[PDB]
Structure 1
Amino acid sequence: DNTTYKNLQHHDYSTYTFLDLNLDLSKFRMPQPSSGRESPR
């Protein structure tokens, strides 16, 4: 029950890492549907 704030690691984010983690989340996920068309136009 030591009391210390342990999310201090979040101070380490430059402004990329969100999207870069999105890149690191590539695959891992089901292919999403194609609807009927390529674009609604």
Structure 2
Amino acid sequence: PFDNTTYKNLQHHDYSTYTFLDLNLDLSKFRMPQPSSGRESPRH
């Protein structure tokens, strides 16, 4: 059924303070290894 009389973006009413951070923490498993510049820091 085609419905355009309702707002479907109602999920953000239940977001907490840490939601972005736990989303990133759960996403951390799928991500690929990062490239390295060869040193720990530019000050090293």
Give the TM-score range, shorter chain: 0.7 to 0.9
Deviation at 1:22, TM superposition (A): 0.3
RMSD, aligned α-carbons: 1.1
Identity percentage over the alignment?
100
> Runs of at least 4 residues of structure 1 off by over 4 A?
none
For structure 2, the 5+ residue unaligned runs are none
For structure 1, the 5+ residue unaligned runs are none
Deviation at 1:23, TM superposition (A): 0.4
CA distance in 2 between partners of 1:6 and 1:24 (Å): 25
| Bigger Cα Rg | 2
**TM, length-normalised to structure 2:** 0.78
Task: Number of aligned residue pairs: give it.
Answer: 41
**TM, length-normalised to structure 1:** 0.83
CA distance in 1 between partners of 2:24 and 2:18 (Å): 10
Tell me the SS of whatever aligns to 1:20. helix
